[PDB]
Amino acid sequence: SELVETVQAGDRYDFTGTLIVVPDVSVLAGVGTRAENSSRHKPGMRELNYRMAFLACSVQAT
Amino acid sequence: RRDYAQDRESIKTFLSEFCKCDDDGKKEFVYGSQLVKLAHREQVLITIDLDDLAEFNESLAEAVVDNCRRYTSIFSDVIAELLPSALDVYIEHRLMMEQRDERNSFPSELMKRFEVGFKPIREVKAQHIGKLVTVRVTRCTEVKPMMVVATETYQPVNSLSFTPVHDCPSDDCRVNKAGGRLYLQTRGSKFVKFQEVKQEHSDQVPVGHIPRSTIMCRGEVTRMAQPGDHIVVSFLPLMGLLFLQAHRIICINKNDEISDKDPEELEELAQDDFYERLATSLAPEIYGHLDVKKALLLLLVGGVDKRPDGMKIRGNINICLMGDPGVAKSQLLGYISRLAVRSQYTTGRGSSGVGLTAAVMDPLTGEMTLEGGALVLADQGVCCIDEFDKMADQDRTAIHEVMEQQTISIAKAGIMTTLNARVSILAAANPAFGRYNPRRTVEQNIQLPAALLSRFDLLWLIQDKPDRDNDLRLAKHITYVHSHSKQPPTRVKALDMNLMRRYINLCKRKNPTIPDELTDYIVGAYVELRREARNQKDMTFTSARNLLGILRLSTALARLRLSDSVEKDDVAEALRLLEMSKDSLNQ
Amino acid sequence: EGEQFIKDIQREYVDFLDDEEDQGIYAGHVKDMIAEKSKRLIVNVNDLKRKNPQRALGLLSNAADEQLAFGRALKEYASTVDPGYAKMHEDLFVGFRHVTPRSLTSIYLGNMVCVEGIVTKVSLIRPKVVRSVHYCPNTRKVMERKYTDLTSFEAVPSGAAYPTKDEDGNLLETEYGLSVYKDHQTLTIQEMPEKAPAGQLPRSVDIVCDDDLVDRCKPGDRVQIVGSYRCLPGKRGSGTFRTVLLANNISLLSKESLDISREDIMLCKKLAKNNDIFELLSKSLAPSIGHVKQAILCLLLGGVEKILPNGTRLRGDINVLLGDPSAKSQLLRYVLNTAPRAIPTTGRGSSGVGLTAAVTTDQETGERRLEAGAMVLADRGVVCIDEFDKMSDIDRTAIHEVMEQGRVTISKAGIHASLNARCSVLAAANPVYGRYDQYKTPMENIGLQDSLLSRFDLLFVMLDVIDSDVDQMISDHVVRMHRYRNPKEYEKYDALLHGKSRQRHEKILSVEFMRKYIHIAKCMKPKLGEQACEAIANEYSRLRSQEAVETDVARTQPITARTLETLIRLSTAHARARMSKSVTIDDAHAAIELVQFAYF
DNA sequence: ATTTTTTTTTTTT
Numbered sequence A: 001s002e003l004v005e006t007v008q009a010g011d012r013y014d015f016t017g018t019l020i021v022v023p024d025v026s027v028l029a030g031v032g033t034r035a036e037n038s039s040r041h042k043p044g045m046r047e048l049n050y051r052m053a054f055l056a057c058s059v060q061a062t
Numbered sequence B: 001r002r003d004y005a006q007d008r009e010s011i012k013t014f015l016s017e018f019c020k021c022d023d024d025g026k027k028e029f030v031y032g033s034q035l036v037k038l039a040h041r042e043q044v045l046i047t048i049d050l051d052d053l054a055e056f057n058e059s060l061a062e063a064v065v066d067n068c069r070r071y072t073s074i075f076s077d078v079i080a081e082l083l084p085s086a087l088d089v090y091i092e093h094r095l096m097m098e099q100r101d102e103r104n105s106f107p108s109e110l111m112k113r114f115e116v117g118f119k120p121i122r123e124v125k126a127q128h129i130g131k132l133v134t135v136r137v138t139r140c141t142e143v144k145p146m147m148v149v150a151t152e153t154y155q156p157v158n159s160l161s162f163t164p165v166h167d168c169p170s171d172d173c174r175v176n177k178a179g180g181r182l183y184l185q186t187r188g189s190k191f192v193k194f195q196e197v198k199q200e201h202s203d204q205v206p207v208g209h210i211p212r213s214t215i216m217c218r219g220e221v222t223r224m225a226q227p228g229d230h231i232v233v234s235f236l237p238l239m240g241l242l243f244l245q246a247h248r249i250i251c252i253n254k255n256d257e258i259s260d261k262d263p264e265e266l267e268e269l270a271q272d273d274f275y276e277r278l279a280t281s282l283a284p285e286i287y288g289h290l291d292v293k294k295a296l297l298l299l300l301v302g303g304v305d306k307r308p309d310g311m312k313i314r315g316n317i318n319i320c321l322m323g324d325p326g327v328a329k330s331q332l333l334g335y336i337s338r339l340a341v342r343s344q345y346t347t348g349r350g351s352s353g354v355g356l357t358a359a360v361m362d363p364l365t366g367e368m369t370l371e372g373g374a375l376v377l378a379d380q381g382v383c384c385i386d387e388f389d390k391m392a393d394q395d396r397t398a399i400h401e402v403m404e405q406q407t408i409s410i411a412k413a414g415i416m417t418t419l420n421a422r423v424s425i426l427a428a429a430n431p432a433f434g435r436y437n438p439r440r441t442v443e444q445n446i447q448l449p450a451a452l453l454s455r456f457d458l459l460w461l462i463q464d465k466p467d468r469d470n471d472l473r474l475a476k477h478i479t480y481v482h483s484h485s486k487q488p489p490t491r492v493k494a495l496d497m498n499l500m501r502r503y504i505n506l507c508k509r510k511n512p513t514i515p516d517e518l519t520d521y522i523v524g525a526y527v528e529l530r531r532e533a534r535n536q537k538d539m540t541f542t543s544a545r546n547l548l549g550i551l552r553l554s555t556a557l558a559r560l561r562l563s564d565s566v567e568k569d570d571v572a573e574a575l576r577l578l579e580m581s582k583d584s585l586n587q
Numbered sequence C: 001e002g003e004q005f006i007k008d009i010q011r012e013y014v015d016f017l018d019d020e021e022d023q024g025i026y027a028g029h030v031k032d033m034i035a036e037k038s039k040r041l042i043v044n045v046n047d048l049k050r051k052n053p054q055r056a057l058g059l060l061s062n063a064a065d066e067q068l069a070f071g072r073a074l075k076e077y078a079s080t081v082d083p084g085y086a087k088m089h090e091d092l093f094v095g096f097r098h099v100t101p102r103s104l105t106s107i108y109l110g111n112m113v114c115v116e117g118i119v120t121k122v123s124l125i126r127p128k129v130v131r132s133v134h135y136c137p138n139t140r141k142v143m144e145r146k147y148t149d150l151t152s153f154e155a156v157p158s159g160a161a162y163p164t165k166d167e168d169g170n171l172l173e174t175e176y177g178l179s180v181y182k183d184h185q186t187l188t189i190q191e192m193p194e195k196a197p198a199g200q201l202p203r204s205v206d207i208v209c210d211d212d213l214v215d216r217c218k219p220g221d222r223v224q225i226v227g228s229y230r231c232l233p234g235k236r237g238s239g240t241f242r243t244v245l246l247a248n249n250i251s252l253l254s255k256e257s258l259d260i261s262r263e264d265i266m267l268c269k270k271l272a273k274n275n276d277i278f279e280l281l282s283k284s285l286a287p288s289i290g291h292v293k294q295a296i297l298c299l300l301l302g303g304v305e306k307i308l309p310n311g312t313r314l315r316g317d318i319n320v321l322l323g324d325p326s327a328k329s330q331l332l333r334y335v336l337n338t339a340p341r342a343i344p345t346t347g348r349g350s351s352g353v354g355l356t357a358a359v360t361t362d363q364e365t366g367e368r369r370l371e372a373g374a375m376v377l378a379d380r381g382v383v384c385i386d387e388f389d390k391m392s393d394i395d396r397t398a399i400h401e402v403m404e405q406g407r408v409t410i411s412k413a414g415i416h417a418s419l420n421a422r423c424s425v426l427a428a429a430n431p432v433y434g435r436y437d438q439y440k441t442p443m444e445n446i447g448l449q450d451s452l453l454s455r456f457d458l459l460f461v462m463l464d465v466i467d468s469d470v471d472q473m474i475s476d477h478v479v480r481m482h483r484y485r486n487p488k489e490y491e492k493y494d495a496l497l498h499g500k501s502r503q504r505h506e507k508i509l510s511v512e513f514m515r516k517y518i519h520i521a522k523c524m525k526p527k528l529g530e531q532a533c534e535a536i537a538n539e540y541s542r543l544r545s546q547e548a549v550e551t552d553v554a555r556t557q558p559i560t561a562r563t564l565e566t567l568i569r570l571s572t573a574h575a576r577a578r579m580s581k582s583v584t585i586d587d588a589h590a591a592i593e594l595v596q597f598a599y600f
Numbered sequence D: 001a002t003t004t005t006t007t008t009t010t011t012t013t
């Protein structure tokens, strides 16, 4: 928040690039392993394919 | 309501004693031959006929015409039980060290190794379920895996949809909890090939109706038809209680023995050695005009090509024609487009094509369907356009890059499209207002850049002025074919188009040469072109490839004389036709 | 077996099946030995009223259950007489107050009644399945379980997937060729709109059909169709109510059938020797019209077809139009009304000549509109339009295509199709300067294009002057029009004399007698003899030599030999106006005066 | 798949 709306188009930076992933809800063309943490058998499901992003903590317009 | 078992014995008697000596050379066993050919394990798919069972008995000749299913699994398992001599090798490895009776016992389909089909829309009425019937392709599709049984539990399918199973429905995981997991062991899984494709010929569609169009074939039968083949195909609904499986694709037109390049003629080929009778049987419909026909017969001839130094050479004839009287150059293009295997037709413009290739031309929806047209598809063939002159000015550049050969680039969507334009072309156009005023010269009388008039090996205006006697001939010859049905009477024995293409097929692979003897002679004769035409700058231009053209026609002609010996005769006609191409407006 | 009254119902129906009505009229060797198998033995309620009126109402008050019983009675009878028409033990329905689609008020439920309207949204075919023919390859017993739905009866099975593993867990499998199925159809009906009220939006109706009842016509035609009612689903325990009416037979009304046994051919053969019926036959398209029409004869007659052995064929048709303004927009009507399904069109329009271009930007359903052509209904038909002088040049191309081939060949993403057509068509006119026809120039006083010489098939003349000698002639014929228009020459009786000094009679001067020689006339094949070729050749030589000179050369633009096709296949249409199995020197004479009227 | 939108190309006297 304290970084919010303190910017505008056209600047130069040295952000923190702390990349993290999507905790997806559903996926399209994410046909890598399709599975789940499901117990075994003896006497709709979900899938998993993500994509990347980034994140930050600090700015210096230069 | 027949018995399902004693029939098995009857067909064992059918399969065993099949040595019907109807021709000298069949005292041996015919289906014994096919039996033992399955003993070669070459044939993974066997074949059945109506004439087969016509002799043995007559029930099942129509007892099975109604079901064609259960009879066929018993046909499977019966001769699966018969041993009169990848997966196959892996299973022995799987059963090499082998609860020995309480087993997940294999179904005979899991060791397929052999298969069967059989032999005997508007009219198809909806009372044909289960009947194996025949009817005479659009949106051709591709080939993918289709299961028959997954494994070692067997979960066989006849349906098209499925769902995976869990645990194991055996005794191992029955009451006892000791057990393991179960997954698809591919190395031991059994699949089958698969293609899918969808319409009527339009020769049986009602006047006040619209041609309507589903075919599902699995296994080996795939890849036995292409988009746009006139085919015959030899009924099962698909699970309010609101498709077809085939075995064979026969085409009396566009198939292996009717198609060129896809011996039989030897008895007649020994009898037949000629070059001129083709005109007598190529399009008898019109009297005279031997030259135009024979020029096209050269385009039918072909057999000219080389790929030296990395680059090819344009080895297809590309003729253009301008002119418009009583010429009737519409019956010719139609004639060629009919007999010519892998033919096409477009017009000057018409609709959805514009006598062109493919284009990404608006606000309709979202597809980016390059839509290959006639000019796209005619390759290894001819696309026969009519009235090219009226086509379009912007269009002339499309014929420019496609002229050379195999080259149609489309840098409009962001793709290197090729489309491999290997098509011979036939161009037919008409003079402007007036009828080829002989005084009004070329590009004075017409208005097309000399870039495209030049790049034709031959241009051939055909005109006939007023002759009191000539058209009389034109009258009576035509009236012969109407008072009667067949034009040429007691002159030459014309040839059926099937035979005609048959003999034509024996002309395409020949690789004709050209002794050195013509190296000097041809360049000497060609010199005359660059002197007596270029002597006056009011004369036609000439191309570097121009001599190569008459070259191309010469070597092509040897395909139909074959013996590798282009003699003074196979360029003497080359020049004969080249000179006859011209000098018709002076006289 | 319901309540046992059903059986006496069966017997009361079967009491129809015994005597002179049955023995002389009804069925047996009136349908069956003619080998048709189309079950429906046609019923008329008034007999039911006459014999068993209570059973004339058993239908109309409870139409749920008369029906299996009707089938029982029929199959019993035909089995009793013919075990050949006996191996198809099915339902076997039969034939059997008309209110509007605007006039169904909760009721007629249970009633077999009539409503009239339009066809629209004729839809797909589906099968529907009757029984399940199961066999057990262990124990090998061909067992069965019928299915049903409300759409035939009240009875329904546990209507579901094929059963299995239900008997024992044995070897259990289906079979086909045995479990038969039913032809199913769906569509909807609109009232005939000419009645329609301006204040409201009219209602449609919805119907269902079955086996032998599959769509001999098209969406946007009108036929009388009779139906019972049901209504299957729930209403809010679920979801609200919506209905349909059904259980039907078929008619068709807006045709001609034609009290035509072999007598009417005897009539056409009767007036045959009358030679210049040509006269009346040309006075059979101008009673209210100078001028031509003997030339329109062939465009009425279509053409002829001829094929090469082991080859291909020829497009056969004729198309002509020409002059000065003010008879052209009230002449063409003669052929919108008389000759079978010959459809004029707009003149300046598209979305209906031949064009589709997948125009579904509203609803966007399954189908992508692969059919918006109204010139392929002209297959073996006739057409006329206006605006030819105003015609787009988009299609002048397309007509260049047609006249050369007469087939369409479009592949705009729907499909790469081609479809037969054997058509003809007419036109309009407007010269941009009026009364300039020849003095300034013959040709191109008109505002036109000259690729189309050989592609229509005659050049003629049409001209006008209000005059001095013809002034009073115009006056007196316009008046004789105006009162030979009128009776005794209601609101208006019959006008005869000057059709009486003309010794005709409107039952020899008539429509049915006119088309007396169409329908067999359009089915003949009268080949040529030994004579045309010679004189036609000499005279086409003279045509192609000397028609282009002497102050008419500028009115001599279309000389081709593609006329010589036309020059002769008109005498064909004439030769099928009299059934003479030849063509003659007299037909030669009669097939050149075209040339004289063109300018001579 | 449709409803509420917008441009960027597709091809021009």
Ligand SMILES: Nc1ncnc2c1ncn2[C@@H]1O[C@H](COP(=O)(O)OP(=O)(O)OP(=O)(O)O)[C@@H](O)[C@H]1O
Pocket: B543, B544, B545
């Ligand atoms: N310097 C050269 N190198 C290679 N080939 C030559 C040369 N000079 C002439 N030729 C021959 O002359 C012929 C010229 O006609 P060509 O087919 O090249 O037209 P084009 O150059 O493709 O026209 P454009 O380049 O304008 O499309 C070529 O086939 C080429 O083989």
Ligand SMILES: Nc1ncnc2c1ncn2[C@@H]1O[C@H](COP(=O)(O)OP(=O)(O)OP(=O)(O)O)[C@@H](O)[C@H]1O
Pocket: C288, C289, C290, C291, C325, C326, C327, C328, C329, C330, C331, C429
């Ligand atoms: N010989 C004639 N026979 C019958 N009617 C005539 C004759 N001469 C003139 N008329 C009448 O004159 C009227 C002319 O106007 P008309 O409706 O023919 O315009 P039009 O000819 O249809 O225009 P266009 O042909 O350009 O469409 C016609 O209604 C016609 O009844």
Ligand SMILES: Nc1ncnc2c1ncn2[C@@H]1O[C@H](COP(=O)(O)OP(=O)(O)O)[C@@H](O)[C@H]1O
Pocket: B285, B286, B287, B288, B324, B325, B326, B327, B328, B329, B330, B331, B474, B478, C561, C562, C565
């Ligand atoms: N030499 C000829 N032999 C036979 N028919 C001819 C001949 N010349 C012209 N015809 C006639 O020409 C007609 C076809 O003309 P067409 O070739 O369509 O003209 P265009 O080529 O200008 O379109 C045919 O019906 C045929 O009868």
